Design a protein that fits this description.
The structure is cut from a larger assembly and holds 2 copies of chain A. By secondary structure, chain A is α/β, with parallel strands linked by helices. Chain A is 41% helix and 11% strand. The first copy, chain A, has 2 domains: 127 residues, translation initiation factor eif-2b, domain 1 (Four Helix Bundle (Hemerythrin (Met), subunit A)), CATH 1.20.120.420; 200 residues, Translation initiation factor eif-2b, domain 2 (Rossmann fold). Chains A, B: InterPro entries: eIF2B_beta_subunit, IF-2B-related, IF_2B-like_C, M1Pi_N, NagB/RpiA_transferase-like.
Chain lengths: 345, 345
Amino acid sequence: HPNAATSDVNVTIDTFVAKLKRRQVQGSYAIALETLQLLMRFISAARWNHVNDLIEQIRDLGNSLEKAHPTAFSCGNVIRRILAVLRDEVEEDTMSTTVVAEPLISSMFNLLQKPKTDYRQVAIQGIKDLIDEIKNIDEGIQQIAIDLIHDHEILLTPTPDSKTVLKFLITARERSNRTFTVLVTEGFPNNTKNAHEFAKKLAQHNIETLVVPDSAVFALMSRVGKVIIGTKAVFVNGGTISSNSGVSSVCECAREFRTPVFAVAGLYKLSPLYPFDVEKFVEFGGSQRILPRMDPRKRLDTVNQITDYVPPENIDIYITNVGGFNPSFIYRIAWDNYKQIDVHL
Amino acid sequence: HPNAATSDVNVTIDTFVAKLKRRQVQGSYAIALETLQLLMRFISAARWNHVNDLIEQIRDLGNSLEKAHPTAFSCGNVIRRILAVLRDEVEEDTMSTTVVAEPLISSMFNLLQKPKTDYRQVAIQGIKDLIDEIKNIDEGIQQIAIDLIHDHEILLTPTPDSKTVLKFLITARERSNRTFTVLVTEGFPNNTKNAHEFAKKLAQHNIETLVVPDSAVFALMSRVGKVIIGTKAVFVNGGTISSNSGVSSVCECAREFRTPVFAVAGLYKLSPLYPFDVEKFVEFGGSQRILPRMDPRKRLDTVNQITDYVPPENIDIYITNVGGFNPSFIYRIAWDNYKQIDVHL
């Protein structure tokens, strides 16, 4: 389905498309908020009267949105989240229009046994609940996370870019009973500016700050207590795409030294998609920021990448608003929020 | 050869044999001293005039001494040490009686190219030098060893029995610039009393003492900086026989956590023998110290062993009076002091 029907009534589709492609929109948290407001505008304005035609139209809109921007997983997840909230209430509604439906638990096995209302209002409130969930994640993290780190323990941190992780770290430092030393890898080609702001906010709160070059990670790994990841997107197998530069090597460095790896994330950040190849999912950077002068750049073919991937073999915990989960279990948390059909849009 | 010739002239042979079998003599350092004084009495008293008949007689005496006591490696090594000091001076003497002898270095390859004096005085002085070497090892250790351990690092120690290691630890604590926390595994069935005296002498010098049960080793390994071994005997492949109880598991615990392993030893403690099987070399303890009452001991077949073995896969450094060496090199240090023939006595 094209945007020919939604042009005069809905204009904000194309402005979000413009915000993605030229990267005017920044940070998964913000991308999610916009798509929420998009779906808010879609239900409030449209006229449908039919339900199945409506849902499949939403599926096509989400399909086009993910094709417009591949790194906007938070875009794709939010739509998929509302899709499933819709689908449950429709399946509840069809049971009343026809007239045991309660075997034991909420399982799977969709290959075995076969099969006017206020539905739109529920769809409205379903968006509102998603916003409030994205608004408050930190409260759900701090009750699980600030139980695992001890006094006189040194914390090494790749990806200082995450707003989520920094605020988790500040709530722990607020506790006068807890003392920890912070090592921060720079992440030269991208994270530098963000890493420097990270080091500034730690000094602002008076926490023992240590700025580390990306070479020196090995030269400290014997002294490191724990490793924390500021992830962007979490996957089925467990693995993460993080907010740029110098993570993968640090995780490899941690595993060889058998140093524990922590990850702080949200369920909206969590994705039901599978990373079959890193080659497709990871976004590459601009080599302009590395080396000046273009006549030597004929011979200097420089390689730089923004997003960094970690395989599930390294990290052990994904502390969310719900709780702490192991990478060998995180798939269930995903299927508790997104349906099997709501993947290939 | 029997002790029928050496009975009225030499009496102290049989008193040392009695000291070994009933374990009246204690600690490898003391066993070495006695055998030195035995060989001191053998040269001072005997009449030989011939050299090759003398050396082969000494070989038979050493063969009988090791058969009398298998755990007295320090006995076996000291004889082997003087044997080689003898053999070099004889080979130097035969070159003058006959009349390049200097190819490059001091090699091996005894399978390639073929072949009155003050010799007895040299044999006398050779014993004297061995004593002085055994008298002073600590001076040669402290100059290599107290260079590797840092401030705020936690040291876990199996085998508190060694006089060598404790004195190495006290010289480092003497340095006001160096601070370290000491964890000590108890070693229940044997080391207990010695471990408690170890903890007392650390408090006497005011070093942060921590007494650890043999179960709790794992529960601390994440926090451990380094591991130190108080070995009794070191071998060709690198591996060690240590002064009793709870070492092997600690070393296994260290390797899994990738925590560094240190060993403090002497060259007289070092052996040219190969441990083909632990089954033969390790001495077993007395089960009386575990469990009382003999009527249940019909059904309670309890297992306890004194000496503990460590494979070379774990430890990394053997700091001696000469210096620090890797287990993949220690064989050369051995061959620099003992000859190839002087093994199978």
